[PDB]
Amino acid sequence: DKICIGYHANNSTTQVDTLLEKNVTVTHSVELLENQKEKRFCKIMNKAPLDLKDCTIEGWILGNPKCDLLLGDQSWSYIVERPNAQNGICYPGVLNELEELKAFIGSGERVERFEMFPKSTWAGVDTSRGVTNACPSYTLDSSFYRNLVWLVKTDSATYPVIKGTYNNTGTQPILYFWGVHHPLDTTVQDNLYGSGDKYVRMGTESMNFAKSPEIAARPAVNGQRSRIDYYWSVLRPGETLNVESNGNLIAPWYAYKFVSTNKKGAVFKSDLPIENCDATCQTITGVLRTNKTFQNVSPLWIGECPKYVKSESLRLATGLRNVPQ
Amino acid sequence: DKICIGYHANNSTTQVDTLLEKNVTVTHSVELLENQKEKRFCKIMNKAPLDLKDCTIEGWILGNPKCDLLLGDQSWSYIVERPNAQNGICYPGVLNELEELKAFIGSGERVERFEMFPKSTWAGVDTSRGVTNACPSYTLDSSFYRNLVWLVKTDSATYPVIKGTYNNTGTQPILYFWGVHHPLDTTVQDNLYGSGDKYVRMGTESMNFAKSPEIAARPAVNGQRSRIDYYWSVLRPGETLNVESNGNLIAPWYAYKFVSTNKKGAVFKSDLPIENCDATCQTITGVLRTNKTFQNVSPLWIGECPKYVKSESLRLATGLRNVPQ
Amino acid sequence: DKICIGYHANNSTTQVDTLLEKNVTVTHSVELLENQKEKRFCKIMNKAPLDLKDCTIEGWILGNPKCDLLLGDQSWSYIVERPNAQNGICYPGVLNELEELKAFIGSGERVERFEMFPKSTWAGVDTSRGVTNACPSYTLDSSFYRNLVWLVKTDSATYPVIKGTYNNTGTQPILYFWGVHHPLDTTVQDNLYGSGDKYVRMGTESMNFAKSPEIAARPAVNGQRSRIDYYWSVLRPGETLNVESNGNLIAPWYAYKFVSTNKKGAVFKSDLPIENCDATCQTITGVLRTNKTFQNVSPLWIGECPKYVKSESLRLATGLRNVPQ
Amino acid sequence: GIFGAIAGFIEGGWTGMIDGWYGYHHENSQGSGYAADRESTQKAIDGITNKVNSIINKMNTQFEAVDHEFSNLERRIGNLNKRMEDGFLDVWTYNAELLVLLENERTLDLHDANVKNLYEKVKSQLRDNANDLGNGCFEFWHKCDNECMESVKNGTYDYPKYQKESKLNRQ
Amino acid sequence: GIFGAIAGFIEGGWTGMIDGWYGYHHENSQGSGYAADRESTQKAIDGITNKVNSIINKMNTQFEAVDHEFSNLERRIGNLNKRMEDGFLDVWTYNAELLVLLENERTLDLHDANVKNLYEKVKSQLRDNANDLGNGCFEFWHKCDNECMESVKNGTYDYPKYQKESKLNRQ
Amino acid sequence: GIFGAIAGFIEGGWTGMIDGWYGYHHENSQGSGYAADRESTQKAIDGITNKVNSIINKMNTQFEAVDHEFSNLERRIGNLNKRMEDGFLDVWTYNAELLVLLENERTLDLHDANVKNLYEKVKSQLRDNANDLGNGCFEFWHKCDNECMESVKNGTYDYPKYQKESKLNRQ
Numbered sequence A, B, C: 001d002k003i004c005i006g007y008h009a010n011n012s013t014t015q016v017d018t019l020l021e022k023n024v025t026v027t028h029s030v031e032l033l034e035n036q037k038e039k040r041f042c043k044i045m046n047k048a049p050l051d052l053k054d055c056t057i058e059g060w061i062l063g064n065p066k067c068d069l070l071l072g073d074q075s076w077s078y079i080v081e082r083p084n085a086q087n088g089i090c091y092p093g094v095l096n097e098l099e100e101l102k103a104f105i106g107s108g109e110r111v112e113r114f115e116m117f118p119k120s121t122w123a124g125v126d127t128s129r130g131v132t133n134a135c136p137s138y139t140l141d142s143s144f145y146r147n148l149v150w151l152v153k154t155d156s157a158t159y160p161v162i163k164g165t166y167n168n169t170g171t172q173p174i175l176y177f178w179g180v181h182h183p184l185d186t187t188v189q190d191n192l193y194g195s196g197d198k199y200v201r202m203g204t205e206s207m208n209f210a211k212s213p214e215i216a217a218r219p220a221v222n223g224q225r226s227r228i229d230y231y232w233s234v235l236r237p238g239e240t241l242n243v244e245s246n247g248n249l250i251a252p253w254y255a256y257k258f259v260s261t262n263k264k265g266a267v268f269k270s271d272l273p274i275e276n277c278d279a280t281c282q283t284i285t286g287v288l289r290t291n292k293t294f295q296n297v298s299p300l301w302i303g304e305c306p307k308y309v310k311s312e313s314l315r316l317a318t319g320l321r322n323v324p325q
Numbered sequence D, E, F: 001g002i003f004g005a006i007a008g009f010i011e012g013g014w015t016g017m018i019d020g021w022y023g024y025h026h027e028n029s030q031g032s033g034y035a036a037d038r039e040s041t042q043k044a045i046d047g048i049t050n051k052v053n054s055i056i057n058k059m060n061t062q063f064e065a066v067d068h069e070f071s072n073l074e075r076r077i078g079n080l081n082k083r084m085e086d087g088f089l090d091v092w093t094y095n096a097e098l099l100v101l102l103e104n105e106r107t108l109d110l111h112d113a114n115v116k117n118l119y120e121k122v123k124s125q126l127r128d129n130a131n132d133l134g135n136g137c138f139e140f141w142h143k144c145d146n147e148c149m150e151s152v153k154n155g156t157y158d159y160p161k162y163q164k165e166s167k168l169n170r171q
Ligand SMILES: CC(=O)N[C@H]1[C@H](O[C@@H]2[C@@H](O)[C@H](O)O[C@H](CO)[C@@H]2O)O[C@H](CO)[C@@H](O[C@@H]2O[C@H](CO)[C@H](O)[C@H](O[C@]3(C(=O)O)C[C@H](O)[C@@H](NC(C)=O)[C@H]([C@H](O)[C@H](O)CO)O3)[C@H]2O)[C@@H]1O
Pocket: A129, A130, A131, A132, A133, A134, A142, A150, A152, A183, A184, A188, A192, A222, A223, A224, A226
């Protein structure tokens, strides 16, 4: 007659590492790291992302005539920008504070497009001849940004002082754009805006802007040796904007009522497909469906994700050393 | 006859947590985290803080006529700015590099106000008519910044080229300010500074500045459609400043000898009372009096404080498991 | 007859600390921290560093006439700049985006100097009289930067519109420099560039620049009350640069083909000797030769170094408590 | 193992004991059988479950990297952001990998100790009445039926009830 | 506990032993009484005091957040600063909370081991001369007056001095 | 020590045992001598070597500080960079110093446990046939020549072979 004391053994071949010992087979364990993803973009909080497709952020928000599919109101849980998108700034020139603009847009959730300055705002000038073959649409060789208007002096007169005002009486901040044209020579200048020293001046309660054309021939881009300095700002609720120019003004026309996300906001640069699915965790390289604590898929995500870590495995022993006999 | 081996038990109801077990009662323990504060501001190194009261940093350092209580020399262990302070920039316009200016001032310890350019410096111009109802004092409806002087051309003459020079022969860096006026129209311009292209130019051994007025009507703020671009710089020991303008100059008048703190420097935005007490550790939300290692009161402090942490309790067991019978 | 169980003891006096106990003598242990360095600079990947000697980064890359020893092509594993180097910007003025320029240069590995705009580029102007006693060489009291050319109008004529173009058809980005002269008065201006409103304009496919002279007397530095605003940019492979000015241009003459390091890149500010030796780990305070995991010598290094840590010792016990009898 | 039981003086585990981590094998006139000690097993399950959840709970924050861009003239801040992100990624990877190695070592020791303490618990009850074979097995100097077996397992074994019979067979 | 003493084979503590952590209760013709083992108590106090101070000393740096402001066009660096500050706050909270849980578990094991070793220390001296009741108590097979009690406590117990008397009563 | 062996019931080490960490001293008619237990020594060397390498491997990243400069008007980002660098320097110093203290404490316990388990391993084989002196030494109740000594050391000691001779001398 006898009684023995002993411990569990099983068919497990799963191993863990310890400080003293590698590859120890244990009866029970738990993996804390997720290495699996669904290679696609899904909805977050049942809200679809915004696919830019063949437009860049600049082309979308400026109103590049080839980004008309996107034109108007948009809501999004995040933004997918495609790596080799072609439709951005068509008429050569720099978008000022571009990186700050992208960060701002990324912090958003919804834009409502609206006419801020009807062309009737600008008195004694031409608002119908501001096109270029630098900016074609899909139907004409010569168009221009939907949200801007290229102002040219009329028939043969001078370019007079034009003025504009918008009072933000709404509850939302307004994202808007404008430009200054820089002709390649003094003839083009004279032919478009006439003679004299020209300026573009803008001001709000908290912002004021002043620029003058800088005439010189730059290398040709999209057939143009001239340039445009694009600009952007945010007109706060309760603020009013004053515009004043006597030439070289690319005027704001349409603008955006901007809803800022309370959350995080993401801009994913990816060529991954957007499918019809829901998710709680969306990384730039795919969706995670886990209850796990760690993941080695990506540090870039939107939603509620596990902690990013470089490890291949974080296997925690729970059972004891497996010693079957 | 017998002897037993055993362990201490007591009346303790204090508990700790372990990795294997929650709410374990122990005979002795020690709390490492402080969660208590005195909701007030005190002295640090027996040095009182500077209360701005109803003035903002800008209003104090520019010499807003309603910040005269603060006007002159100040020493401080730190700065308390009040959340709804009204006296800042009275005449509308932007203070350039504002955030950098605040960080600079925060790194300080003492300012000595002194007359840098007496109004006698500026020859052939009027230095007595530079007031506005945008900047009232408590006694007149129309005043101006104590540290600046608004220069206007005389009687009917032209605004000539005025000049000024200061050679920093002292041991301390000098914090000073200046501005450029931007009238709403060309009449106001002409009425104040006369006809011609105007400029404000400034230079030291390491700094040079040039600006010209930008004439346009901005939305009205404090009754003004005009603007002023305020500026600031630091004249290093041994450097000299040259001023040269022919109009639109808001001149430096009084400036500050600036003593930089060797320590940290803080600017607290709070509505907490400053009382007559001493402290070694001052957070933005109150004083800590502890010998403890951790605290969950605030990450923002001046003085020698415990490490900030999000925990509610960090109770370390010292005695053994309490098992009374 | 008997058998005893026991443990090793030895002559060790080496001690470790534990959480429960300080200064415990152990039979065997291992030190993980290196505190030793060779106080000198050596080669990294058998590649020598670049010693600036008595030139600063600015003086070297601008072509200060006293930095001729460095003039031309350079390869380097890292850069040693000497603390009291005297040869930098000789003609007073600011190098724009200086800190960004240093970071850029630091990311490099090799520069190839080459003539970008021969003086023959500039038609109808003088390219032979652009010297100053602000910038002496070791042989003449009046010289100028080797990579720039100070353009002055000819004999008695006007300063016409000069133009220049370079098309980067190579595989390497090109680092180049230029300036704008700011005379102290309107006479010097007129005497050098003639009458009229002058400008310096530059543009590439992605960059455009425009500046006009700002005439004022600044404090004298190296005998000069005038200034120069120095500038720099990088012409990308495939880009072309257009230059257009009618006066006040310090022209680009020689430029650099720039090879960017795939690695890290370092700029060491030290007075340490560069000797004829090889190394794998080079800190700013000396060479480390270790197989150790930690070091308390410096956080600043180039090469493969151990983790920097503030500790004096990280001694890990391996053997047991030493109890000899 | 530092307690010397698991893969020690008790050389292997029991595939036949499927209902717990620690337990017994008994053998008498009514036959053989395995049985888990539910109390020490449950206590261990509770401790280890607590350890796992405590780790998960402390690792329940995330450092968040951003998609922010930087121009050619923002090389310094661009690289600051990069070094910061890589910075936290390195400390968290370290924290996770090191914790797991440390915790696995201590988890296995815990089990070892528990098996060890269970063995001592039985040895302390039997004393004279059984012979310790040095492998976790005790041979009784008396007859131990099913209720006697169960008394050893619930810690109510009656030493003086069996000592006369044991002493007779022992000597 | 992994050493099986505290709240184990010694089921409870002693409210009556007020002058230390570990000690003895004796009982003879002169009566009963508690007494701390000062040596093992002091050694434990010293170890644990060292552990507490070592932790305090390593946690003796502070990450310092700033009151610096950022404009509307410095959203990127403003958020970099925020993520950095929140970054270090998260690692230090983790470090503190995890250390405390780990250290508490090991502190309690230390005490458990110390009580266990004290019991073994006494068992090793008595051997034959006393009966182990399995609860930390030893019944002497001989008369143990106050000096005999004290000899057991300072580890100078004289086994051969009492073995004849013990053996007689034991058998 | 928490296992009570090293600098415990075995009061000191042996300078005479030079070929390992744990081992034996025997004494019979052929004389005296030290010998390491290679198996438990090697196992300990392997464990500890693994611990050292695992630590080195986890500490195999570096945070890299930069020589980047900042102008007078970049005080905010300049100080952000400084606080970040000092930030990581502080966590890594903490991680290293704390790990070393923790690991040293557990390394010494490991050895203590190993010596303890080796002693138990020998006690379990001898049982009756030897007298435990309470200091790691066993006096045989029989003659143990060199092969008998070696059998105890490789765990093949033959208890029943010597029990008659032992029992005679013991009683
Ligand atoms: C070959 C070449 O580069 N030619 C350009 C020309 O330079 C001349 C040289 O050819 C010649 O060797 O030397 C000359 C001096 O001696 C000149 O340097 O310069 C002209 C303009 O002065 C260029 O014409 C432009 O060519 C473009 C080609 O893509 C394009 O056709 C431009 O037309 C548009 C446009 O689509 O953008 C026509 C638009 O209706 C008009 N829109 C508006 C609202 O004005 C614009 C606009 O006038 C300009 O964009 C303003 O810069 O122009 C055409 O102007 C020629 O390419």
